[PDB]
Amino acid sequence: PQITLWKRPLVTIKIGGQLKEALLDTGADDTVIEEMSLPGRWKPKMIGGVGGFIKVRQYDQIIIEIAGHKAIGTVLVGPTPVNIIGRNLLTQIGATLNF
Amino acid sequence: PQITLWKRPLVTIKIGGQLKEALLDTGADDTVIEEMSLPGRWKPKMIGGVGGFIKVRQYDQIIIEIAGHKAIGTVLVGPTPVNIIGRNLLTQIGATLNF
Ligand SMILES: CC(C)CN(C[C@@H](O)[C@H](Cc1ccccc1)NC(=O)O[C@H]1CO[C@H]2OCC[C@H]21)S(=O)(=O)c1ccc(N)cc1
Ligand SMILES: [Cl-]
Ligand SMILES: [Cl-]
Ligand code: NA
């Protein structure tokens, strides 16, 4: 698809068998999702945005469908205000910015 | 141009007579620049992201040149850790996400 930016670029994702809404975010290095259960071990990480930093849980090699495209990669879990698909998984689905 | 997302999508902008580097950020509703002077009226605003909220000055009808493309709109000025070009100006340069 070609997604314009007049509204938020929200898509459906599927993770752990559950559908969620997430933002395609070229300003995010990292995918970060709201609190949920994921399999395996996690590692600590801090991520910093406009209001400061938060602690998140880093899960690696997580299966996640994004707008119907399959990705397998790192998902951060923590008190983000919105689910965000960052560049680590945008590259897996072949996304580019065009103007 | 077509900008891949292996690295942060940074571009050169011109704003208020000044050249700056800024992030093309589809996850940002609004454009937010580090502290600088801009002419004209402003009003205070709070914007929230990961980490919480910051207080900014909202300047309307500001012209910015973004990687060679002129646009006008609202620019928020405050203690953002990174200069961010948000959707309000991305739309004006015809930026899309494609995959
Ligand atoms: C500020 C950026 C350099 C980094 N952010 C991504 C950014 O796109 C967020 C993503 C985002 C979106 C909604 C809520 C929180 C964060 N947008 C944002 O802060 O935009 C603000 C300006 O316009 C407003 O519209 C959205 C909030 C305001 S971030 O959310 O802090 C973040 C940082 C690191 C990772 N790995 C993932 C996300
Ligand atoms: Cl605007
Ligand atoms: Cl358009
Ligand atoms: Na103005």
Backbone angles phi, psi at B61, to 5 degrees: 55, 50
CA-nearest residue to B53 within chain A is: A51
Resolution of the experimental model, in Å, one decimal: 1.2
The shortest CB-CB distance from A69 to any of B47, B98, B99 is to B99
CA-closest candidate to residue A80, choices A21, A14, A40, A39: A21
Domain count for chain A: 1
- Write out the residue range of the structural domain in which residue A66 sits: 1-99
Distance B50 CA to ligand 1 centre (A): 6
With beta carbons less than 8 A apart as the criterion, state whether A97 and B95 touch: yes
The shortest CB-CB distance from B50 to any of A4, A26, A51 is to A51
Cβ within 8 Å, pair A3-B97:
yes
CA-closest candidate to residue A70, choices A13, A30, A18, A22: A13
CA-closest candidate to residue A48, choices A67, A69, A32, A35: A32
Cβ of residue A49 lying under 6 Å from some atom of ligand 1: yes
Distance B91 CA to ligand 3 centre (A): 7
CA-closest candidate to residue B66, choices B9, B7, B3, B14: B14
Residue of A4, A5, A13, A84 to mutate for B, most B C-beta atoms under 10 A: A5
SS3 label, residue A90: helix
Q: Find the CATH number of the domain harbouring B83.
A: 2.40.70.10
In chain B, which residues have their Cβ closer than 8 Å to the Cβ of A48?
50-51, 81
Backbone angles phi, psi at B7, to 5 degrees: -125, 170
Compute the distance between CA of residue B91 and CA of residue B44 in angstroms, rounded to an integer: 24
Q: Which helix (H) or strand (E) holds A88?
A: helix A87-90
Q: Say what the alpha-carbon torsion angle B70, B73, B76, B81 is, to the nearest 10 degrees.
A: -30
Amino acid found at A27: G
